[PDB]
Write an enzyme that holds these catalytic residues in place. Structure first.
Site, short mmCIF file in Angstrom:
data_model
loop_
_atom_site.label_atom_id
_atom_site.label_comp_id
_atom_site.label_asym_id
_atom_site.label_seq_id
_atom_site.Cartn_x
_atom_site.Cartn_y
_atom_site.Cartn_z
N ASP A 4 1.01 -1.07 0.00
CA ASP A 4 0.08 -0.04 -0.31
C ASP A 4 0.97 1.44 -0.41
O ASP A 4 1.45 1.26 -0.39
CB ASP A 4 -0.87 -0.29 1.57
CG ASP A 4 -2.13 0.91 0.90
OD1 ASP A 4 -2.59 1.69 0.79
OD2 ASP A 4 -3.26 -0.38 0.61
N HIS A 47 -4.74 5.94 3.57
CA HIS A 47 -4.82 4.59 2.82
C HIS A 47 -3.92 3.91 3.77
O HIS A 47 -4.87 2.60 4.36
CB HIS A 47 -4.90 4.55 1.45
CG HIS A 47 -5.63 3.36 0.87
ND1 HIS A 47 -4.76 2.18 0.30
CD2 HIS A 47 -6.66 3.30 0.50
CE1 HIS A 47 -5.89 1.41 -0.29
NE2 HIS A 47 -7.37 2.26 0.03
N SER A 80 -11.16 -1.16 -0.82
CA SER A 80 -10.06 -0.71 -0.88
C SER A 80 -10.37 -1.60 0.90
O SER A 80 -9.38 -3.16 1.21
CB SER A 80 -9.29 0.51 -0.24
N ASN A 85 -13.69 0.29 -7.80
CA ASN A 85 -14.31 0.93 -7.18
C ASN A 85 -15.53 2.47 -8.29
O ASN A 85 -15.54 2.89 -8.13
CB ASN A 85 -14.21 2.29 -6.18
CG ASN A 85 -13.72 1.75 -5.25
OD1 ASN A 85 -13.93 0.58 -4.34
ND2 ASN A 85 -12.03 1.93 -4.60
#
Ligand code: NA
Ligand code: NA
Length: 274
Positions: A32, A63, A220, A154
């Protein structure tokens, strides 16, 4: 004092944890934006950084710490609680603070995790196109014993249109979709034939940089729930293979509706880890 994010009960992680299975001694890498390792509810044992100028134990975006938090935020009397609170967390920084990375950062990050013995690899990142390098990367990690879990996307549903993306599209990687707390699919959840399971995704509250917690939305957020569930499955049955875990996740899932929208269903770590 400690918050139990709706996700944990929704997938029955609390059940298995009550069985005494918390993902202990299972290695989990999170590819990430880094991880605010100094956060009190997180325990990043190690990792690597493939982004220039940034160490692997800092999260300039947020994130990364969020997704780590879903998988293993420490079971204690503070913050939140993770799906597999005793897992060995590894920060593999491949996205910079804008949430962007190159095919080589990502490929290098997977190559490292496979070399270094990671059992589960979580990827809450994606893209419209893949690459021969990435496909071969996830194919080996998988063939070598790793459980590669990736966010589906998404992009909602554009009708017949398969909105699922890489790395999730590939068949060595589990593409995870997002459901809200009512167990309903999320409008943003990408649809497609290679959609495998649904894990909590809307209103996900987790660890956030600068020692605090925030609520985020995305597949996520769905992804680490499964990377997490694979860990509880491996701790309880360490003799299982990646295909055997993968199969348990998908096979025991709770049916919600059409697979082009829900895959096999919302996951159930209790039935899976049976
Ligand atoms: Na905690
Ligand atoms: Na897939």
């Amino acid at each position: 004092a400690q918050t139990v994010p709706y996700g944990i009960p929704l997938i029955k992680a609390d059940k298995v944890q009550a069985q005494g299975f918390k993902g202990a001694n299972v290695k989990v890498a999170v590819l990430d934006t880094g991880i605010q390792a100094s956060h009190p509810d997180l325990n990043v044992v190690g990792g690597a950084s493939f982004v220039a100028g940034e160490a692997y134990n800092t999260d300039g975006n947020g994130h990364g710490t969020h997704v780590a938090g879903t998988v293993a935020a420490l079971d204690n009397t503070t913050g939140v609680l993770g799906v597999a609170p005793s897992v060995s967390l590894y920060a593999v920084k491949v996205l910079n603070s804008s949430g962007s990375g190159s095919y080589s950062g990502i490929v290098s990050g997977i190559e490292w995790a496979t070399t270094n013995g990671m059992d589960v690899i979580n990827m809450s990142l994606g893209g419209a196109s893949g690459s021969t390098a990435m496909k071969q990367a996830v194919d080996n990690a998988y063939a070598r014993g790793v459980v590669v879990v990736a966010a589906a996307g998404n992009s909602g549903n554009s009708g017949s249109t398969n909105t699922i993306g890489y790395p999730a599209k590939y068949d060595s990687v589990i593409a995870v979709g997002a459901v809200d707390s009512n167990s309903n699919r999320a409008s943003f959840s990408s649809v497609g034939a290679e959609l495998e399971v649904m894990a909590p995704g809307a209103g996900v509250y987790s660890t956030y940089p600068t020692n605090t917690y925030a609520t985020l939305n995305g597949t996520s957020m769905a992804s680490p729930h499964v990377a997490g569930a694979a860990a509880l499955i491996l701790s309880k049955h360490p003799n299982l293979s990646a295909s055997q875990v993968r199969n348990r996740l998908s096979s025991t899932a709770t049916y919600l509706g059409s697979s082009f929208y829900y895959g096999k269903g919302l996951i159930n770590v209790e039935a899976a880890a049976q």
